[PDB]
Short mmCIF file of C-alpha atoms and ligand atoms in Angstrom, two decimals:
data_model
loop_
_atom_site.label_atom_id
_atom_site.label_comp_id
_atom_site.label_asym_id
_atom_site.label_seq_id
_atom_site.Cartn_x
_atom_site.Cartn_y
_atom_site.Cartn_z
CA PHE A 86 -1.54 -1.26 0.52
CA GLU A 87 -4.71 -0.03 2.49
CA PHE A 88 -4.63 1.85 5.59
CA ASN A 89 -7.37 3.53 7.26
CA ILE A 90 -7.25 6.66 9.75
CA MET A 91 -9.99 8.24 11.29
CA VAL A 92 -9.38 11.22 14.12
CA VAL A 93 -11.84 11.79 16.77
CA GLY A 94 -12.16 14.42 19.37
CA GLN A 95 -13.99 17.93 20.41
CA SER A 96 -14.39 21.03 17.94
CA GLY A 97 -11.23 23.14 17.95
CA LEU A 98 -8.32 20.61 18.98
CA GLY A 99 -6.75 20.40 15.41
CA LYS A 100 -8.05 16.94 14.05
CA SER A 101 -7.99 18.64 10.54
CA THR A 102 -4.85 19.90 11.30
CA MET A 103 -3.34 17.00 11.82
CA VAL A 104 -4.83 15.41 9.28
CA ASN A 105 -2.94 17.47 6.75
CA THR A 106 0.25 17.32 9.18
CA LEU A 107 0.18 13.43 8.33
CA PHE A 108 -0.04 14.03 4.96
CA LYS A 109 2.81 16.87 4.70
CA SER A 110 5.21 15.00 6.62
CA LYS A 111 8.96 15.36 5.30
CA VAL A 112 9.81 11.84 6.16
CA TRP A 113 7.66 10.44 3.15
CA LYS A 114 9.07 10.48 -0.47
CA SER A 115 6.78 13.18 -1.49
CA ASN A 116 3.90 15.37 -0.33
CA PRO A 117 0.23 16.13 -2.13
CA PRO A 118 0.14 19.32 -3.14
CA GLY A 119 -2.32 21.88 -1.67
CA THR A 120 -9.37 24.24 6.36
CA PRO A 121 -12.22 25.69 8.42
CA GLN A 122 -14.21 24.16 11.00
CA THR A 123 -15.37 20.59 10.00
CA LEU A 124 -19.19 20.19 8.92
CA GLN A 125 -18.91 16.93 7.45
CA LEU A 126 -17.35 13.22 7.69
CA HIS A 127 -14.70 13.18 4.70
CA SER A 128 -12.01 11.12 4.00
CA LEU A 129 -8.73 12.12 2.29
CA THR A 130 -6.70 8.93 0.39
CA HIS A 131 -3.19 9.24 -0.80
CA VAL A 132 -0.43 6.81 -1.90
CA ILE A 133 2.15 7.66 0.13
CA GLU A 134 6.03 6.43 0.01
CA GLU A 135 8.38 6.03 3.43
CA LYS A 136 11.66 4.24 2.10
CA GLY A 137 10.61 0.66 1.37
CA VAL A 138 7.27 0.42 2.37
CA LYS A 139 4.58 1.95 0.15
CA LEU A 140 0.66 3.03 1.54
CA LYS A 141 -2.66 3.95 0.25
CA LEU A 142 -3.43 5.76 3.66
CA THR A 143 -6.91 7.06 3.87
CA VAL A 144 -7.89 9.69 6.78
CA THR A 145 -11.02 10.08 7.65
CA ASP A 146 -11.79 13.73 8.87
CA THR A 147 -14.84 14.09 11.51
CA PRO A 148 -16.66 16.98 12.95
CA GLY A 149 -15.79 18.21 16.45
CA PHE A 150 -18.44 16.96 19.13
CA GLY A 151 -18.88 18.86 22.53
CA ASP A 152 -20.42 22.45 21.59
CA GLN A 153 -23.92 22.01 22.45
CA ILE A 154 -25.90 22.30 25.25
CA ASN A 155 -26.57 18.21 25.43
CA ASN A 156 -24.19 16.10 23.79
CA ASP A 157 -25.97 13.17 23.95
CA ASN A 158 -25.57 10.47 21.21
CA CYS A 159 -22.94 12.66 19.73
CA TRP A 160 -21.11 9.42 18.78
CA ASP A 161 -23.74 8.30 16.50
CA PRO A 162 -22.34 9.52 13.38
CA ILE A 163 -18.30 8.25 13.62
CA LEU A 164 -19.82 4.49 15.13
CA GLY A 165 -22.31 4.54 12.39
CA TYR A 166 -19.21 5.02 9.87
CA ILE A 167 -17.04 2.49 11.90
CA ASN A 168 -19.93 -0.14 11.36
CA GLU A 169 -20.25 0.91 8.12
CA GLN A 170 -17.15 -0.27 6.96
CA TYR A 171 -17.29 -3.47 8.70
CA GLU A 172 -20.79 -4.13 6.76
CA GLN A 173 -19.30 -3.54 3.42
CA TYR A 174 -16.45 -5.62 4.07
CA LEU A 175 -18.95 -8.26 5.68
CA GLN A 176 -21.13 -8.12 2.25
CA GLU A 177 -17.87 -8.55 0.24
CA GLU A 178 -17.05 -11.80 1.35
CA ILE A 179 -20.61 -12.92 1.28
CA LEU A 180 -20.53 -11.85 -2.17
CA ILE A 181 -17.38 -12.62 -3.49
CA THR A 182 -15.51 -14.81 -1.08
CA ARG A 183 -12.03 -14.09 -1.80
CA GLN A 184 -10.40 -10.89 -0.05
CA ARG A 185 -8.03 -10.34 -2.71
CA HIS A 186 -10.86 -8.51 -4.32
CA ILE A 187 -12.25 -6.62 -1.45
CA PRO A 188 -11.11 -3.11 -1.16
CA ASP A 189 -10.47 -2.59 2.87
CA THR A 190 -12.24 0.77 3.80
CA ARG A 191 -12.21 -0.67 7.57
CA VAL A 192 -11.12 1.87 10.23
CA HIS A 193 -7.55 0.32 11.37
CA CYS A 194 -7.14 3.01 14.02
CA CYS A 195 -9.13 6.29 15.57
CA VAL A 196 -6.90 8.44 16.76
CA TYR A 197 -8.64 10.83 19.71
CA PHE A 198 -8.02 13.93 20.47
CA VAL A 199 -7.97 14.92 24.27
CA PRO A 200 -8.60 18.91 25.77
CA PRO A 201 -5.16 19.64 27.03
CA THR A 202 -6.73 20.78 30.21
CA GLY A 203 -3.80 19.62 32.43
CA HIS A 204 -6.82 17.99 34.55
CA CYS A 205 -8.09 14.81 34.01
CA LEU A 206 -10.37 12.90 31.19
CA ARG A 207 -13.77 14.65 31.05
CA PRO A 208 -17.15 12.32 31.44
CA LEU A 209 -17.98 13.18 27.61
CA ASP A 210 -14.50 11.87 26.65
CA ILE A 211 -14.67 8.76 28.85
CA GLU A 212 -18.37 7.85 27.38
CA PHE A 213 -17.14 8.74 24.05
CA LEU A 214 -13.65 6.30 24.46
CA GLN A 215 -15.61 3.62 26.01
CA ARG A 216 -18.28 3.23 23.17
CA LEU A 217 -15.04 3.38 20.23
CA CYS A 218 -12.41 1.03 22.24
CA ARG A 219 -15.00 -1.65 21.65
CA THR A 220 -15.53 -1.42 18.21
CA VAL A 221 -12.02 -0.20 16.96
CA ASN A 222 -8.18 0.60 17.74
CA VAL A 223 -7.83 3.89 19.67
CA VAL A 224 -4.92 5.42 19.90
CA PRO A 225 -5.68 8.85 22.42
CA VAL A 226 -3.35 11.80 21.96
CA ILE A 227 -3.69 15.46 23.92
CA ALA A 228 -4.00 17.91 21.42
CA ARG A 229 -2.49 21.52 21.12
CA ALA A 230 0.10 20.30 23.32
CA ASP A 231 1.93 23.45 23.29
CA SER A 232 -0.02 25.18 25.44
CA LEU A 233 1.28 23.07 28.09
CA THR A 234 4.62 23.07 29.08
CA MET A 235 6.97 19.68 29.25
CA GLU A 236 6.16 19.08 32.80
CA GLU A 237 2.54 19.93 32.37
CA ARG A 238 2.24 17.33 29.72
CA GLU A 239 3.84 14.40 31.45
CA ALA A 240 1.44 15.24 34.67
CA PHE A 241 -1.62 15.29 32.55
CA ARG A 242 -0.44 12.57 30.93
CA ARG A 243 -0.30 10.34 33.87
CA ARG A 244 -3.64 11.43 34.87
CA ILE A 245 -4.86 10.40 31.93
CA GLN A 246 -3.31 6.96 32.02
CA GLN A 247 -4.81 6.39 35.52
CA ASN A 248 -8.27 7.74 34.21
CA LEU A 249 -7.86 5.17 31.66
CA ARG A 250 -7.33 2.56 34.16
CA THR A 251 -10.25 3.55 36.41
CA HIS A 252 -12.95 3.35 33.69
CA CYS A 253 -11.65 0.75 32.41
CA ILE A 254 -10.96 2.01 28.68
CA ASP A 255 -8.08 -0.36 27.39
CA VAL A 256 -6.45 1.83 24.37
CA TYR A 257 -3.80 0.05 21.72
CA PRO A 258 -2.06 -1.50 22.19
CA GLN A 259 -4.14 -3.42 24.70
CA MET A 260 -1.59 -5.35 27.03
CA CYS A 261 -3.60 -8.69 26.78
CA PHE A 262 -2.74 -8.45 22.46
CA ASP A 263 0.89 -8.48 23.85
CA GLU A 264 2.10 -11.92 21.77
CA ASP A 265 5.88 -12.17 23.33
CA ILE A 266 8.22 -11.04 25.87
CA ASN A 267 9.61 -8.98 22.94
CA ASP A 268 5.84 -7.39 22.12
CA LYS A 269 5.26 -6.64 25.64
CA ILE A 270 9.08 -4.75 26.47
CA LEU A 271 8.51 -2.51 22.91
CA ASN A 272 4.59 -2.11 23.86
CA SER A 273 5.49 -0.96 27.18
CA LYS A 274 7.62 1.90 26.03
CA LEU A 275 4.86 2.96 23.91
CA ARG A 276 2.29 2.30 26.55
CA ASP A 277 4.35 4.82 28.90
CA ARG A 278 3.83 8.03 26.53
CA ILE A 279 0.14 7.02 25.36
CA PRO A 280 -1.26 10.01 25.31
CA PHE A 281 1.01 11.25 23.10
CA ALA A 282 1.73 15.20 23.55
CA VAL A 283 1.14 16.33 19.95
CA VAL A 284 0.93 19.58 18.06
CA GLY A 285 -0.24 19.93 14.49
CA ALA A 286 0.94 21.92 11.62
CA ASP A 287 -0.03 21.96 8.05
CA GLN A 288 2.35 24.86 6.96
CA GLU A 289 6.12 24.58 6.52
CA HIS A 290 9.04 26.57 7.59
CA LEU A 291 12.72 27.30 6.50
CA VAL A 292 14.23 26.86 9.75
CA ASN A 293 18.09 27.07 9.75
CA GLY A 294 18.28 25.42 6.20
CA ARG A 295 15.78 22.90 6.88
CA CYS A 296 11.86 23.15 5.53
CA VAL A 297 9.71 22.19 7.90
CA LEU A 298 6.52 21.88 8.98
CA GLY A 299 5.93 24.11 12.25
CA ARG A 300 3.46 26.36 14.10
CA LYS A 301 5.55 29.72 13.91
CA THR A 302 4.45 31.71 16.91
CA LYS A 303 6.52 35.27 18.27
CA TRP A 304 8.89 33.20 19.98
CA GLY A 305 9.98 30.70 16.95
CA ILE A 306 8.70 28.13 15.32
CA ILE A 307 7.39 24.67 16.94
CA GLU A 308 8.46 21.82 14.59
CA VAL A 309 6.10 19.10 14.82
CA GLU A 310 8.08 16.50 13.43
CA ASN A 311 11.18 17.56 16.19
CA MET A 312 11.45 15.34 18.96
CA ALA A 313 12.07 18.07 21.20
CA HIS A 314 9.62 20.29 20.51
CA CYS A 315 6.39 17.35 20.97
CA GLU A 316 5.31 13.99 20.23
CA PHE A 317 3.87 13.56 16.92
CA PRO A 318 6.79 11.77 15.44
CA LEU A 319 5.91 8.97 17.83
CA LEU A 320 2.48 8.78 16.92
CA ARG A 321 3.82 9.29 13.24
CA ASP A 322 6.05 6.22 13.34
CA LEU A 323 3.30 3.89 15.73
CA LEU A 324 0.68 4.59 13.10
CA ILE A 325 3.02 4.07 9.72
CA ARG A 326 5.88 2.22 10.68
CA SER A 327 6.01 0.49 13.36
CA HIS A 328 2.66 -0.86 14.37
CA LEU A 329 0.59 -0.80 11.05
CA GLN A 330 0.56 -4.18 10.41
CA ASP A 331 -1.05 -4.68 13.93
CA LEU A 332 -3.45 -2.57 13.75
CA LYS A 333 -4.93 -4.12 10.83
CA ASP A 334 -4.72 -7.22 12.07
CA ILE A 335 -6.53 -6.35 15.23
CA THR A 336 -8.56 -4.79 13.23
CA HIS A 337 -9.66 -8.01 11.49
CA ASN A 338 -9.14 -10.78 13.69
CA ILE A 339 -11.03 -8.82 16.51
CA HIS A 340 -13.12 -6.20 15.75
CA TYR A 341 -14.11 -6.98 12.80
CA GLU A 342 -14.56 -10.93 13.51
CA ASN A 343 -16.72 -9.38 16.76
CA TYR A 344 -18.78 -7.46 14.28
CA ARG A 345 -19.32 -10.59 11.69
CA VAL A 346 -20.31 -13.09 14.76
CA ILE A 347 -22.55 -10.89 16.26
CA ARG A 348 -24.15 -9.64 12.86
CA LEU A 349 -24.55 -12.98 10.83
CA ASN A 350 -26.81 -14.31 14.00
N1 GNP B 611 -1.76 25.90 19.53
C1 GNP B 611 -2.16 25.07 18.23
N2 GNP B 611 -3.22 25.26 17.67
C2 GNP B 611 -3.46 24.39 17.05
C3 GNP B 611 -2.96 22.96 16.92
N3 GNP B 611 -3.37 22.67 15.60
C4 GNP B 611 -4.35 23.11 15.07
N4 GNP B 611 -4.44 24.19 15.90
C5 GNP B 611 -5.26 25.55 15.50
O1 GNP B 611 -6.29 25.62 16.07
C6 GNP B 611 -7.77 25.78 15.46
C7 GNP B 611 -8.77 24.87 14.98
O2 GNP B 611 -7.72 24.07 14.21
P1 GNP B 611 -8.82 22.66 13.41
O3 GNP B 611 -7.98 21.27 12.83
O4 GNP B 611 -9.78 23.37 12.63
O5 GNP B 611 -9.63 21.80 14.60
P2 GNP B 611 -10.68 21.10 14.36
O6 GNP B 611 -10.60 19.60 15.64
O7 GNP B 611 -10.49 20.22 13.38
N5 GNP B 611 -11.77 21.48 14.79
P3 GNP B 611 -13.22 21.06 13.99
O8 GNP B 611 -13.78 19.87 14.94
O9 GNP B 611 -14.76 21.92 14.70
O10 GNP B 611 -13.22 20.74 12.82
C8 GNP B 611 -6.90 26.58 14.23
O11 GNP B 611 -6.71 27.79 14.47
C9 GNP B 611 -5.82 25.64 14.03
O12 GNP B 611 -4.48 26.56 13.58
C10 GNP B 611 -1.84 22.74 17.52
O13 GNP B 611 -0.87 21.72 17.62
N6 GNP B 611 -1.54 23.92 18.42
MG1 MG B 612 -12.11 19.86 11.22
#
């Protein structure tokens, strides 16, 4: 069961740390055993399993942008990767016809990391998000959210949500794809919290008898899978549990078909 994720965002926002956090989550039956500034695109693939649901999960890690003087076209490698997977899938459909034998490398969701400035969406992130949402599912997150208080996280989230409407950035789950009243009720709860205020952690700690992922500070451990500490469980549950199939369905029937229709002509 193939599912492909990609992390995107400014350098130094915890993207690579979040990749390891996803694979090391204590909700999987078992975790794979065993980073600095990312210099190349690289994908990790591991068969993970939650109670009943087995997954071949791929997470593509990307070099961060926004450090040079001029960041024009810093979206090309990432957009290039996304369209390459659509191209491979289309060429496989042309050649072998039956999807049973086509490995699905298409990016089913992009997790876009927003700097926890507490202000509003930066023009560079707006430009990147507008280009990304045209071709792939995008779930934005407030990165390294432990640097904001709970109240600051919420106010920043509300401003980002306003910015997304102003610049017409339709992030996942898009309201136009709510197929039912049940979908509207469930997806409105998710849209209320997006962007999730996430914290990443690749280290495990023993806290009150529990082996948990966390960031150890002078004041204690920030437990990244604890809803009282951050909203990583919301991102994790969305991607792997509740909306995995919907993300793949939109990728196949909306984004990939848009690529297939255009390129075939
Ligand atoms: N406070 C805090 N620090 C974090 C968090 N996640 C990662 N960090 C720290 O932030 C730094 C950068 O982490 P990293 O994952 O390498 O960021 P990156 O986005 O992968 N960088 P790049 O794009 O340049 O590879 C490290 O010191 C890491 O320990 C987080 O949720 N909170
Ligand atoms: Mg990195």
